[PDB]
Motif scaffolding. Structure first.
Motif, short mmCIF file in Angstrom:
data_model
loop_
_atom_site.label_atom_id
_atom_site.label_comp_id
_atom_site.label_asym_id
_atom_site.label_seq_id
_atom_site.Cartn_x
_atom_site.Cartn_y
_atom_site.Cartn_z
N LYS A 146 0.82 -1.20 0.00
CA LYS A 146 0.00 0.00 0.00
C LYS A 146 0.85 1.25 0.00
O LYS A 146 2.07 1.17 -0.11
CB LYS A 146 -0.91 -0.02 1.22
N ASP A 147 0.25 2.42 0.17
CA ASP A 147 0.99 3.68 0.10
C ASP A 147 1.10 4.44 1.42
O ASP A 147 0.49 4.06 2.42
CB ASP A 147 0.30 4.56 -0.94
N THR A 231 5.14 -0.21 0.89
CA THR A 231 5.01 0.63 2.08
C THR A 231 6.31 1.18 2.60
O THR A 231 6.33 2.25 3.20
CB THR A 231 4.33 -0.13 3.22
N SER A 234 7.21 4.18 0.22
CA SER A 234 6.26 5.21 0.66
C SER A 234 6.81 6.36 1.47
O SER A 234 6.37 7.51 1.33
CB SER A 234 5.14 4.72 1.55
N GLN A 237 8.13 8.98 -0.70
CA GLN A 237 7.08 9.58 -1.52
C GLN A 237 6.27 10.67 -0.80
O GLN A 237 5.67 11.57 -1.38
CB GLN A 237 6.11 8.52 -1.99
#
Ligand code: HEM
Length: 291
Positions: A146-147, A231, A234, A237
């Motif tokens: 996921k992010d 993740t 992330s 990001q």
């Protein structure tokens, strides 16, 4: 739900330092595990997954009850591979049958970090085993695909803030992902059984490539042979997360200090300690003991 810490009868610092030394001596002895990584990384992962079930809203889950000893939590798909940390600790529980399960699983994580030359983690005793019916249901531990918004949101349930989350994730410098446990494969760095701030350094300095692995999952891969989970990547990001990553790649002592506070907090979530309860113990390492 109230969970009050109850010290094991008549036990004090010296008793728990004996259990510490037992775990630490066996970490040195059983060194061949997982192609010579040894048991330390799977033991800090076990201490994180028995604590990571906590929910701040109703105080269910968490490290207090030692409920990972029950089939429902032991067989959670998210815990695959942690049976190896359990079987490592099972000899030591036979030797010190007076320590509770929650306490033994959390002290194994403390012992592994300090013996892999991490920071000292203050640890407190008094978790009490609770019945099979108190076992949290599967699905409280995080997905890897996921992010950043998912990671921030998931960790609010354990009320950890951005700083605490980024300091905790630095533990992914340790050990590796194993395709048959999680559908991800590879280590995140060269020193994967010594505690350092290399997770942050590799995230910022490697050339990452989004590839698909043999389990058909995407992961970030580098020329050096390292990998990062979705993740994990992330953290560079998101702008709030990225500036704390830079802080910990530029200061290993601040990383160690903040990890120590957030890992103790992780391990203590849900537990009420009475004011006559003993202070947190700081255990000496085998090295400081000349052992
Ligand atoms: C969103 C957060 C997290 C996710 C999705 C996650 C996910 C994973 C996954 C998929 C693995 C590989 C398991 C395997 O194949 O054997 C892993 C391993 C590991 N994780 Fe996490 N993790 C997270 C946070 C943390 C935190 C907060 C800690 C500790 C404070 C931690 C410590 C470890 C360690 C030490 C390993 C290595 C285990 C080994 O070598 O066998 N994880 N993580």
């Amino acid at each position: 739900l109230v969970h009050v810490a109850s010290v094991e009868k008549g036990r004090s610092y010296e008793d728990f330092q004996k259990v510490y030394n037992a775990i630490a001596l066996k970490l040195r002895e059983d060194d061949e595990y997982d192609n010579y990584i040894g048991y330390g990384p799977v033991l800090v992962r076990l201490a994180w997954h028995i604590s990571g079930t906590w929910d701040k809203h109703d105080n269910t889950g968490g490290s207090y009850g030692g409920t990972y000893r029950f089939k429902k939590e032991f067989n959670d798909p998210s815990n695959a591979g942690l049976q190896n940390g359990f079987k490592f600790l099972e000899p030591i529980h036979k030797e010190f049958p007076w320590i509770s399960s929650g306490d033994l699983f959390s002290l194994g994580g403390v012992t592994a970090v300090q013996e892999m030359q991490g920071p000292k983690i203050p640890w407190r005793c008094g978790r009490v085993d609770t019945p099979e019916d108190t076992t949290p249901d599967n699905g409280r531990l995080p997905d890897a695909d996921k992010d950043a918004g998912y990671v921030r949101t998931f960790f609010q349930r354990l009320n950890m803030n951005d700083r605490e989350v980024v300091a905790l994730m630095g533990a992914h410098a340790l050990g590796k992902t194993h395709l048959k446990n999680s559908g991800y494969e590879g280590p995140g760095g060269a020193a994967n059984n010594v505690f350092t701030n290399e997770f942050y350094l590799n995230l910022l300095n490697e050339d990452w490539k989004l590839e698909k692995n043999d389990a058909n999952n995407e992961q970030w891969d580098s020329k050096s042979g390292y990998m990062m989970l979705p993740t994990d990547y992330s953290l560079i990001q998101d702008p709030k997360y990225l500036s704390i990553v830079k802080e910990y790649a530029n200061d290993q002592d601040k990383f160690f200090k903040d990890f120590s506070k957030a890992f103790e907090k992780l391990l203590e979530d849900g537990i009420t300690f009475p004011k006559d309860a003993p202070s947190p113990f700081i255990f000496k390492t085998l090295e400081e003991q000349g052992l």
